[PDB]
Design a protein around this ligand. Sequence first.
Ligand SMILES: CC(C)(COP(=O)(O)OP(=O)(O)OC[C@H]1O[C@@H](n2cnc3c(N)ncnc32)[C@H](O)[C@@H]1OP(=O)(O)O)[C@@H](O)C(=O)NCCC(=O)NCCS
Ligand SMILES: CC(=O)N[C@@H]1[C@@H](O)[C@H](O)[C@@H](COP(=O)(O)O)O[C@@H]1O
Ligand SMILES: CC(=O)N[C@@H]1[C@@H](O)[C@H](O)[C@@H](COP(=O)(O)O)O[C@@H]1O
Lengths: 156, 161
Amino acid sequence: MSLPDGFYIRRMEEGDLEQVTETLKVLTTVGTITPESFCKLIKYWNEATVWNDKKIMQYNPMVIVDKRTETVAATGNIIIERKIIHELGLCGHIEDIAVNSKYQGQGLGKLLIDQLVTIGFDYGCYKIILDCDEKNVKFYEKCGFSNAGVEMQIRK
Amino acid sequence: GSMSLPDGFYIRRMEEGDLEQVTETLKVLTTVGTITPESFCKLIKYWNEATVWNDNEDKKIMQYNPMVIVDKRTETVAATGNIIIERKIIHELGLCGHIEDIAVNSKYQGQGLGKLLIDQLVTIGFDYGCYKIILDCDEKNVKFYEKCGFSNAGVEMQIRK
Ligand SMILES: CC(C)(COP(=O)(O)OP(=O)(O)OC[C@H]1O[C@@H](n2cnc3c(N)ncnc32)[C@H](O)[C@@H]1OP(=O)(O)O)[C@@H](O)C(=O)NCCC(=O)NCCS
Ligand SMILES: CC(=O)N[C@@H]1[C@@H](O)[C@H](O)[C@@H](COP(=O)(O)O)O[C@@H]1O
Ligand SMILES: CC(=O)N[C@@H]1[C@@H](O)[C@H](O)[C@@H](COP(=O)(O)O)O[C@@H]1O
């Protein structure tokens, strides 16, 4: 599970605004975001912790960076939830996976999911889930995931 | 902070004292296990204080919204469900609600209690300003959820420790 030479993964930072918004736009609508508001979002994500009786960050936004060009090749996040079931169990929610086109087909998506999963299991999650489009199911099965249900949504 | 619902039920946020009844209810869903009153009390404290950053400081956004529907006839918990609020970067730093852990006690099944619960959770998420609310269900319940206004949006994938 190591990244290809030249690429590294790290927690998303305030200075990533431009590259991250650009990357996420290939996934869905992003819209207008100011540096000021992004600053605020990053502080929230950097401070929210999950009660643990070892510090658990509720948000774990990652970026994989191609060091040569300082370009964000991909981004993904894993959100940690504490429940009552499974003896006050922890559940990880992988969200907002996006790999830039120029960087796909190189194994970076799988390595990103692998790193997110590791973050979750290291925190003690009894399970990690995510929702994907039917056309991405095979990629997720190759990351070790299995079909568990149907995602249902309702929009405002 | 209680709200009456049709047919002699009312809804309210979960409390420390609901441990025994909530434990029994969630077993309808999956393993609950052993949970002490002190641990449960700490969980409730965490759930009552965790907020999602926002600018309407007049309406705090609770990260966790653990609800119980109590049967007035018996003053016992009939159902429980939660909606967890997540702040994203997409949709202009949008909010996504995640409905989780829906458990209706078996004596109440077939009474429309599930719908009542889901409808209240959705209201809670949209009142917070969520652009969408999602949940994962078994194939069997897709129809039930469609009766609640939800539509098939994708596939839930998991990996277990
Ligand atoms: C994340 C995503 C881009 C794939 O990332 P990726 O870096 O291209 O994929 P990887 O190189 O890590 O591939 C891992 C494995 O999954 C397979 N795979 C990737 N995409 C696949 C597809 N569409 N169909 C089938 N298998 C696929 C690869 O062949 C590889 O398997 P192998 O090791 O047996 O060869 C894609 O699966 C996805 O979910 N896209 C939606 C979100 C996003 O990034 N979107 C913009 C799309 S334009
Ligand atoms: C595994 C993964 O990345 N799933 C994503 C989800 O996290 C993201 O929020 C959403 C955006 O779609 P939306 O704009 O319709 O909400 O797409 C996919 O479901
Ligand atoms: C809509 C709904 O209620 N979905 C629940 C989910 O929230 C819960 O965590 C899980 C328990 O199953 P588990 O023990 O397999 O985690 O069951 C269902 O998928």
